[PDB]
Design a binder for this molecule. Structure first.
Ligand SMILES: C[N+]1(CCc2ccc(NC(=O)CCCC(=O)O)cc2)CCCCC1
Lengths: 212, 217
């Protein structure tokens, strides 16, 4: 089991910037049996670089590859938007054939604060016998953000489930959704519901809440 | 077009088994090596087994210790992947891949076959509307949402006013909470198109055959 380690795990490159990522193997492998794949959400991995330094059909000349032994790398002379994806190195030298953990390439843009919006459980939902409080935090950058639920001054940790979207295709921003789900009573049995988002765009947190 | 065609999506119960198929067109599988690779949700890639259709010889990653069985039929130009004692760690996308069949080109990967192993029953999603509370303050623009909760299996289809709103929309990736999925969607429109012009939420569940529209008021 020749283990492949890719560095960095995630990274961002402003347009036109030069990019480089590495792949190191636990033992040496033939440079001819080491390849790189590109994958975008929802479709199959596609051969990007074969035999260490060769480009696959249709791959832009801005990409290159180099190495031998246990150390390899992939490079993009100039970052373009469609380069944004996850790249995996692969050894087809000795079985079991393995893949690296991948390098996710994202687009770097100007920071932008999160547009928060909280919402209370619908009577439709309340009458069903439950209560979910939802809060959206849309179009922001970078991806780093923390969300807290303060149910009557006593932060509620359990019962919360989040979901993040992929880097937006148009503005290259991120978005997140947090959903606090309590029961029928638990919800009306309190009346202070807050969604607090702390993002690097500002020291002062962004808060949103409602009563009853 | 040289291409690898895989069988359809699988929804199996744990303890059961399932056989996936991959048919090559454009080359004979007997002239190359056929493989199966696995990709767990939002995870990485794992090679499972390899087979030489010319002599039936196989290679397996010890981790798929006799749980995976690879076979091939040169007559139908098809490769198979049999998986027994299905558990949830088995849920994933399975790709069959061919080593380059011809000089001058790369390898070939199938479209992928999604396998979901769950004990859950078919359940329709409950759709709830997400609109601002009593008061309101933003000016020029407003954001509305939709909560799709407790459904199985994937997926659900959410659109705002039948594809009318295709900008400023954020439908978040579903989440599994005790065998059931839950997801939510939001959209933003100028306060000039709302609340005068109706903004609708349309969520449809392919499995339970449910089609529900939630009007944001
Ligand atoms: C199916 N594969 C293929 C590995 C592999 C990939 C590429 C090559 N060779 C080439 O891509 C040459 C391409 C020639 C060209 O494009 O000019 C050999 C082995 C091995 C098992 C795991 C999944 C990946």
């Amino acid at each position: 089991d020749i283990v492949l380690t890719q560095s960095p795990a995630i990274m961002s490159a402003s347009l036109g910037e030069r990019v480089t990522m590495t792949c190191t193997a636990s033992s040496s492998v033939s440079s001819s049996n080491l390849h790189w794949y590109q994958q975008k959400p929802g479709s199959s991995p596609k051969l990007w670089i074969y035999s260490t330094s060769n480009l696959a059909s249709g791959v832009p000349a801005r990409f290159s590859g180099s190495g031998s032994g246990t150390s390899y790398s992939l490079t993009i002379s100039s970052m373009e938007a469609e380069d944004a994806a996850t790249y995996y190195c692969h050894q087809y030298h000795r079985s079991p054939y393995t893949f690296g953990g991948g390098t996710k390439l994202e687009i770097k843009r100007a920071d932008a604060a999160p547009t928060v919006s909280i919402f209370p459980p619908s009577s439709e939902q309340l009458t069903s016998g439950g209560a979910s409080v939802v809060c959206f935090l849309n179009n922001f950058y970078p991806k780093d953000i923390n969300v807290k639920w303060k149910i009557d001054g006593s932060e509620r940790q359990n019962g919360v489930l989040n979901s993040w979207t992929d880097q937006d295709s148009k503005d290259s921003t991120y978005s997140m959704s947090s959903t606090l789900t309590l029961t029928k009573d638990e919800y009306e049995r309190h009346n202070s519901y807050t969604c607090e988002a702390t993002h690097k765009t500002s020291t002062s947190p962004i808060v949103k809440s409602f009563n009853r | 077009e040289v291409q690898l065609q895989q069988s359809g999506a699988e929804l199996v119960k744990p303890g059961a088994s399932v056989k996936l198929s991959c048919t090559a067109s454009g080359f004979n599988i007997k002239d190359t090596y056929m493989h199966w690779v696995k990709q767990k949700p939002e995870q990485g890639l794992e090679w499972i087994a390899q087979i030489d259709p010319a002599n039936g010889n196989t290679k397996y990653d010890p981790k798929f210790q006799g749980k995976a069985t690879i076979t091939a039929d040169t007559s139908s130009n098809t490769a198979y992947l049999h998986l027994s004692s299905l558990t949830s760690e088995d849920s994933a996308v399975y790709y069959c891949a061919a080593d380059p069949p011809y000089y001058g080109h790369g390898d070939y990967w199938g479209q992928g076959t999604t396998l979901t192993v769950s004990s859950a029953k078919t359940t329709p999603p409950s759709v709830y509307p997400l609109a601002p509370g009593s008061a309101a303050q933003t000016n020029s623009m407003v954001t509305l949402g939709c909560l799709v909760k407790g459904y199985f299996p994937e997926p659900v289809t959410v659109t705002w006013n039948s594809g009318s709103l295709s900008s400023g929309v954020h439908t978040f990736p579903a989440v599994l909470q005790s065998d059931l999925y839950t997801l939510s969607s939001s959209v933003t429109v100028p306060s000039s198109t709302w609340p005068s012009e109706t903004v609708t939420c349309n969520v449809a569940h392919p499995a339970s055959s449910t089609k529900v529209d939630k009007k944001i008021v």
